[PDB]
């Protein structure tokens, strides 16, 4: 029974330019002009430290997700407006707010992801599992599960709300609609839930999220309706474009993907998959007549595969959203994802399985991921020498290497760490380390690791 | 004989899905999903091969320009519609077409820029000056001036029209409005126009551009009105953002920029410059109270200077466009640029001068540009061994190194090179070399140069 | 010799495709699609039988929990068996049918494969190897490197070989004498034999015999060592 008036709340958290621009539009400008958005250009999606420049990075993936979300917003505002946007106040300009909101929401997702992709985050978690023992009295509290089960969504929210500090504790000061629709999992690490398997915000954001809920009609475990659209766009985008990158790299062929989709027990009779396969086969028959090398033929065929699969999946997602709009607006929505409720469920699942089999588990990818895990763990080990004990009071950081390595951390991150709040000291220093590591690009991480290892030779005997 | 918005917003395509998406909107998707768009992430804007991940690259520059153009289009369509768009048929929806058209035009504006920035292009030109001598009868014709004065816009047009070939001769098959608006300088190298100092297309596109004009009501010399918007957005988004990058790199300080603007002869009494300086000083006074390092203070002061300057310049550009819309719609418009006819001319010119003084002409920048020039010239010398004589008939390319080098060139560019047309053979060879080199990223160019130099050790004797 | 040529063609056409699949340059389904989409193998009975048997075995193989690389490897392991058996049987049948023509004093048969029922499958496999195995980035780069190595080594050896038989004493430089001493003694012994061959022909034959007999690693090592030893005379 949620109302679109509060779901599209244009107010901002900071207590009270902008010439001919809605506040939601200004949120997109704030997100785009932020340093983490630019740093996304050197964060891995699937293949780390890739030499090929046509393979998706985190920034290109984010922009493509934003474009897909903006297209869905265009299809929802200029069309089907009377079907999903019922009982909306006249002051709200849907045609300008909804597409901008979806585009900004898609762009801002994966902003806080750690370097080296998902396997990077695991590495961080593993470090936080060893250096923050659960049996230890200091870290026995379950709030430290924010670090032992580290994920990029909570870091994205922290970055957009606290880390991007200029002179206030409100970060980028995004609108309530963007902050509400940015939370992919409305639950904390301490809270237990079966609907969501991942925490969506840190303990430090627990009040902030509450504020957002109080200003949007949401609550714990209830997602903003546009969060489902953003998640569906994210899934579609990475599932298709990772397959494109795999085939372009040469790890697989276009016929390999076609045979995988055809032989999948779920896509064998799926109408969307059948239509996509038929169109791709029809275009590939025409393409094969040209005098092309096999690699060029594969890339040409999979560009049309991109077009057809993206169009079909986006249409299915829009239809599913329009059909289940009442369910999404319910105060007790239980939908896991928009893709599962659409007809493109089987095709997306098959694409994800193909990306896992021929992608993530490739030999070069695995070796690069092990190297990145070693780099990340070494960097966190060296940073902990300068971070640990700074907030509790123990002066183990007073060594020259500790002081220098504390000086190498982000200044705004240290300002947030040096703030006076109710967070426990160990949580504060662990959060500082998590922010520092997750804010780094791959190349910056390698360079800093090498430099600090060179500078650590004396204190490491 | 003023042009009409019906012809200027022509959504037809050159070639003789689409579920709820306008054609101009689909042009943005075609541009964004194109490989060169994401290859722009590794092409220099000002600082070549910069280790700082926050310094703007060509992709971030293009995205910022696209966002600014989309904002201006939103202002033009949603707000200033009755005074800017007149006698517009109901078939074209301005609210969806104009913002999308401007966003696509801004995103595509620097797709074909050569590696290592403008200086890199200069390097290419220098090589084409030596290896295609004017006194030689083979290259005596003025058409080869397309290569002696190589520019990124000419390469971008042929990239979006011919180089992105799958099975057509129409490239990405963009709409006529998108193709017309992307032509920054509507003149060829052979043509002698005093209005435009640079050619905007090669001889190979001489027919194609003509077609665009025939379908848009334009002509040689006259420029699409939205191209002025794109040029103004590009100028603003590089003038401000390059200054921000200069401050971030440590080459200058916030007070340095403030003093440069205040001491500027034209910005001394400029109202826009005075307003920007006053607002920045007011914010910086509050910012200086907090315990901050000088670098962080400069960074977060420039973070507000960027917001204020971008807002003021965008508003001034929109006002200038609205005031002079009749002149821009004239068949014989003579306006050089939108910035110069606006109230933000002085501030933008001063920012460009500041970037020239502090950003370029810097020791590290100059050294890196010389290294990039050497790299580009060596790579082009190596590729000319495998390219020269391929079309004329001279079998000097038949050495094993020449065959391998030809095989290392992009298959799309080779496919376009081997097409049957009326272009001169020497022109085709030089165009193949220019297309191969201009599309490379910096890292790819360095890697290919090193690998081919290692492989050339025998034939170089 | 026709039997040998047919066996050579079969044993490289099938085994090079297997090597292509093993290296990861292509997949088993890629080869199956290439054979099925081939113009001549579209209706070839031997190709149809091989494809059907391979598909039947691969359907059973795909049930087990396997990585894609292992599935491709063990599917091509059965494709090799089926294709080799069919091609060998076809070659034997063709030889038996045309034995009288092969025993003719003026036989004109180009090859045993082309006159057999396995011509289309072998030709398609050769085309697949050309498309995917050769003309590959790594293969082309390695071949260019090998060409440079071979040409440099032959240039270095020509300094010690040229003029040895004609009479021109341009080989008498210390590098030339050492290079000649580094050539195989069997090939030098054949080169120094007295016969009616032209002196230039003998010198070129000595160089060709010396170079063609080298392995790849030996060629690289000798090229590097002689290039290091040639730094003075190369000035
Ligand atoms: N190299 C490598 N890449 C992976 C792996 N797993 C996933 N990826 C890729 C696929 C995606 O583009 C991205 C993972 O997607 P996300 O982490 O953003 O999913 P998230 O849990 O945030 O929410 P979602 O599943 O989209 O609902 O990295 C892996 O195990 N190894
Ligand atoms: N390192 C370096 N960067 C330069 C130089 N000249 C310009 N840049 C920067 C400024 C711009 O962001 C960009 C050049 O853009 P352009 O002005 O050349 O674009 P275009 O001529 O096509 O149109 P426009 O002049 O902007 O109206 O690189 C230079 O000489 N050295
Ligand atoms: C300067 C820089 C920082 N980083 C990482 C390191 C930190 O984890 C994170 C923040 O460090 P910062 O040095 O504070 O980055 P910034 O000041 O340029 O921009 P902002 O503070 O608004 O984010 O950015 C990189 O990955 N590459 C770089 O070049
Ligand atoms: C693959 C690749 C190409 N390039 C350059 C080199 C060429 O000049 C240009 C085209 O070479 P291609 O390799 O043909 O690029 P692509 O086919 O993958 O994508 P598209 O043709 O749609 O652009 O791209 C890079 O800079 N880095 C790379 O990784
Ligand atoms: C010894 C040796 C020779 N070769 C090449 C170099 C010569 O071209 C060719 C003959 O050189 P030889 O050294 O004379 O070979 P061999 O005498 O041991 O055996 P045989 O004469 O019966 O063949 O063999 C290698 O490739 N690797 C080696 O280790
Ligand atoms: Mg994502
Ligand atoms: Mg530009
Ligand atoms: Mg053989």
Author numbering:
A (entry chain A): 0 to 15, 25 to 469
B (entry chain B): -1 to 14, 25 to 469
C (entry chain K): 235 to 469
Study text:
pmcDeoxynucleoside triphosphohydrolase (dNTPase) enzymes are effector proteins in animal and bacterial cells that hydrolyze dNTP nucleotides and inhibit viral replication. We therefore named the dNTPase-NTase anti-phage defense system Clover and designated the dNTPase protein as Clover protein A (CloA) and the accessory NTase protein as Clover protein B (CloB). Likewise, CloA exhibits strict dGTP substrate specificity, with the activated enzyme only hydrolyzing dGTP and leaving other dNTPs including dTTP unaffected. Together these results demonstrate that CloA is a dGTPase effector that senses phage infection by specifically responding to elevated dTTP concentrations associated with viral replication. Clover defense encodes an accessory enzyme CloB that synthesizes an additional nucleotide signal p3diT that suppresses CloA activation and protects uninfected cells from aberrant nucleotide depletion. p3diT binds to CloA in an allosteric site adjacent to the dTTP binding pocket and raises the threshold of intracellular dNTP levels required to trigger full Clover immune activation.
To define the mechanism of nucleotide signaling in Clover anti-phage defense, we mutated the Salmonella CloA active site (H126A/E129A) to allow direct comparison of dGTP substrate interactions and determined cryo-EM structures of CloA in the suppressed CloA–dGTP–p3diT (2.6 Å) or activated CloA–dGTP–dTTP (2.6 Å) states. Remarkably, the CloA–dGTP–p3diT and CloA–dGTP–dTTP structures reveal that p3diT and dTTP each bind at the CloAAB interface in structurally distinct sites that remodel to accommodate the inhibiting or activating nucleotide signals. In the CloA–dGTP–dTTP active state structure, dTTP is bound at the CloAAB interface in an adjacent pocket to the p3diT binding site formed by loops α3A–α4A and α3B–α4B from each CloA protomer and the C-terminal helical bundle α18B–α21B. A distinct set of conserved CloA residues form 13 hydrogen-bond interactions with dTTP that coordinate the nucleotide triphosphate moiety at each of the α-(R47A and S418A), β- (K256B), and γ-phosphate (R47A, Q172A, and N420A) positions. The dTTP ribose sugar backbone is coordinated by the side-chain of CloA residue R47A and the peptide main-chain of residue A444A. The thymidine base is recognized by an extensive series of interactions with CloA residues R47A and Y452A that sandwich the nucleobase face and residues D61B and T449A that make sequence-specific contacts along the Watson-Crick edge and explain the exquisite specificity of CloA for dTTP as an activating nucleotide signal. In contrast, in the dTTP-bound active state, dGTP is coordinated by an additional set of five contacts that reorient substrate interactions and complete active site formation. First, dTTP-binding induces a conformational change that repositions sidechain R66A to form new hydrogen bond interactions with the peptide backbone of T52A, Q53A, and N121A that stabilize loop α3A–α4A in the dGTPase core.
